[PDB]
Design a protein around this motif. Structure first.
Motif, PDB file in Angstrom:
ATOM      1  N   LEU A  65       0.863  -1.161   0.000  1.00 22.13           N
ATOM      2  CA  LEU A  65       0.000   0.000   0.000  1.00 22.13           C
ATOM      3  C   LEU A  65       0.907   1.221   0.000  1.00 22.13           C
ATOM      4  O   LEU A  65       2.030   1.168   0.495  1.00 22.13           O
ATOM      5  N   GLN A  66       0.429   2.319  -0.559  1.00 21.52           N
ATOM      6  CA  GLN A  66       1.239   3.524  -0.594  1.00 21.52           C
ATOM      7  C   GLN A  66       1.241   4.200   0.767  1.00 21.52           C
ATOM      8  O   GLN A  66       0.307   4.059   1.559  1.00 21.52           O
ATOM      9  N   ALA A 102     -10.813  -0.648   3.822  1.00 21.27           N
ATOM     10  CA  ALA A 102     -10.217   0.502   3.158  1.00 21.27           C
ATOM     11  C   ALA A 102      -8.944   0.144   2.389  1.00 21.27           C
ATOM     12  O   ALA A 102      -8.718   0.635   1.286  1.00 21.27           O
ATOM     13  N   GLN A 103      -8.124  -0.732   2.969  1.00 25.91           N
ATOM     14  CA  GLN A 103      -6.900  -1.148   2.308  1.00 25.91           C
ATOM     15  C   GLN A 103      -7.195  -2.064   1.112  1.00 25.91           C
ATOM     16  O   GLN A 103      -6.529  -1.975   0.091  1.00 25.91           O
ATOM     17  N   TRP A 105      -9.915  -1.970  -0.805  1.00 26.32           N
ATOM     18  CA  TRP A 105     -10.383  -1.139  -1.905  1.00 26.32           C
ATOM     19  C   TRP A 105      -9.259  -0.270  -2.479  1.00 26.32           C
ATOM     20  O   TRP A 105      -9.236   0.017  -3.670  1.00 26.32           O
ATOM     21  N   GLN A 106      -8.298   0.115  -1.639  1.00 26.71           N
ATOM     22  CA  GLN A 106      -7.149   0.864  -2.129  1.00 26.71           C
ATOM     23  C   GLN A 106      -6.344   0.065  -3.159  1.00 26.71           C
ATOM     24  O   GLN A 106      -5.895   0.612  -4.163  1.00 26.71           O
ATOM     25  N   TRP A 109      -8.367  -0.001  -6.350  1.00 22.79           N
ATOM     26  CA  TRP A 109      -8.306   1.303  -7.003  1.00 22.79           C
ATOM     27  C   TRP A 109      -6.953   1.576  -7.628  1.00 22.79           C
ATOM     28  O   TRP A 109      -6.854   1.938  -8.799  1.00 22.79           O
ATOM     29  N   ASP A 110      -5.902   1.431  -6.837  1.00 21.92           N
ATOM     30  CA  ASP A 110      -4.577   1.806  -7.301  1.00 21.92           C
ATOM     31  C   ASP A 110      -4.145   0.990  -8.498  1.00 21.92           C
ATOM     32  O   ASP A 110      -3.422   1.487  -9.360  1.00 21.92           O
ATOM     33  N   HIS A 143     -15.353   3.518   2.189  1.00 19.99           N
ATOM     34  CA  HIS A 143     -14.162   2.858   2.728  1.00 19.99           C
ATOM     35  C   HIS A 143     -12.921   3.628   2.307  1.00 19.99           C
ATOM     36  O   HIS A 143     -12.599   3.696   1.125  1.00 19.99           O
ATOM     37  N   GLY A 144     -12.234   4.213   3.283  1.00 18.66           N
ATOM     38  CA  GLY A 144     -10.976   4.902   3.047  1.00 18.66           C
ATOM     39  C   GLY A 144     -10.973   5.868   1.876  1.00 18.66           C
ATOM     40  O   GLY A 144     -10.086   5.818   1.028  1.00 18.66           O
ATOM     41  N   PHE A 146     -13.078   6.021  -0.527  1.00 19.39           N
ATOM     42  CA  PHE A 146     -13.735   5.479  -1.711  1.00 19.39           C
ATOM     43  C   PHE A 146     -15.224   5.356  -1.457  1.00 19.39           C
ATOM     44  O   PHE A 146     -15.658   5.036  -0.354  1.00 19.39           O
ATOM     45  N   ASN A 168     -13.643   7.598  -6.373  1.00 21.19           N
ATOM     46  CA  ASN A 168     -12.730   8.364  -5.535  1.00 21.19           C
ATOM     47  C   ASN A 168     -13.427   9.657  -5.131  1.00 21.19           C
ATOM     48  O   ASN A 168     -13.678  10.525  -5.966  1.00 21.19           O
TER      49      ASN A 168
END
Length: 284
Positions: A65-66, A102-103, A105-106, A109-110, A143-144, A146, A168
């Motif tokens: 994760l970033q 949240a992580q 979905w990150q 997304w990313d 979620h985070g 999103f 986003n």
């Protein structure tokens, strides 16, 4: 070069299933590759992000994760098809926890992942196996950073198909994900119906886009996920007249995420399914 023809590898597999040697070899195979470190997954701040204490990603193949907390229990698993100039990419992960949605979905997304394959029900015998990380339509979920909405939900005997719109919130950029939830396959076990499973894997193959990973998860991200990855790999090999050695497919997965294909029943099942797909492929 090929060690045998596809035909010969299938005769070998059939013989070994009958004699018991195929399962003996499976039971002998390492669960975790010697010499791959597992450290980040055990850091104090990451322990609660693992659904199962001892189902952990290797440092080298974990998904990053970033930014600050870089940790998610997820692994890159890439299966190479020999000199077919083909690599099938996956991200194998656990069923998200309430606080890791949240992580999850990150990552989606990313990497703009367009397909999620979920191989578990949310609960088994009243025990939660995965948090529901998507909203029931027409509800919306956040979620985070999103915004998630379920655009459609359609059921078949073995699986549910959902289209999800991920927004986003900051920028309003939109990304669509197909989500398939296979509900007829219990933890540590085999699909309730082999034909339904094979149709489903064919469907997954039809949705794969080259060079984009398919995200696959169950509860722990290793048993049912490993069976699916093994079966897709075998279908690619069959089609290409390349020999299939399931023990080597399992080893190659396990070098990327430990313990994939958890039980003897799972391995036996996928070996039998491979023989069936091979034989059907000869007919057409």
């Amino acid at each position: 070069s090929n060690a045998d023809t596809l035909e010969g590898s299938m005769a070998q597999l059939k013989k070994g299933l009958e004699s018991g040697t195929v399962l003996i070899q499976f039971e002998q195979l390492y669960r975790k590759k010697p010499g791959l470190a597992i450290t980040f997954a055990k850091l104090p701040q990451n322990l609660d992000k693992n659904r199962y204490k001892d189902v952990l990603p290797y440092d080298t193949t974990r998904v990053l994760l970033q930014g600050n907390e870089d940790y998610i229990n997820a692994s890159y698993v890439n299966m190479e098809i020999p000199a077919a100039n083909l690599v099938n990419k996956y991200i194998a992960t656990q069923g998200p926890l309430p606080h890791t949605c949240a992580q999850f979905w990150q990552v989606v997304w990313d990497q703009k992942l367009s397909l999620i394959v979920m191989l578990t029900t949310l609960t088994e015998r009243g025990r939660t196996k995965c948090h529901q990380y998507w909203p029931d339509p027409p509800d919306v979920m956040n979620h985070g950073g999103f915004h998630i909405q379920c655009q459609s939900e359609d059921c078949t005997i073995a699986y549910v198909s959902r289209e999800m719109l991920v927004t986003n919130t900051q920028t309003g950029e939109e990304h669509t994900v197909t989500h398939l939830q296979y509900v007829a396959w219990p933890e540590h076990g085999v699909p309730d119906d082999s034909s339904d499973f094979l149709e489903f894997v064919n469907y997954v193959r039809s949705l794969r886009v080259d060079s984009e990973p398919v995200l696959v998860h169950c509860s722990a991200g290793i048993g049912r996920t490993g069976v699916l990855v093994t079966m897709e790999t075998a279908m690619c090999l069959t089609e290409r007249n390349l020999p299939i050695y399931p023990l080597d497919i399992v080893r190659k997965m396990r070098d990327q995420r430990a313990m994939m294909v958890q039980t003897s029943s799972q391995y036996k099942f996928v070996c039998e399914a491979i023989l069936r797909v091979y034989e059907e492929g000869l007919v057409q």
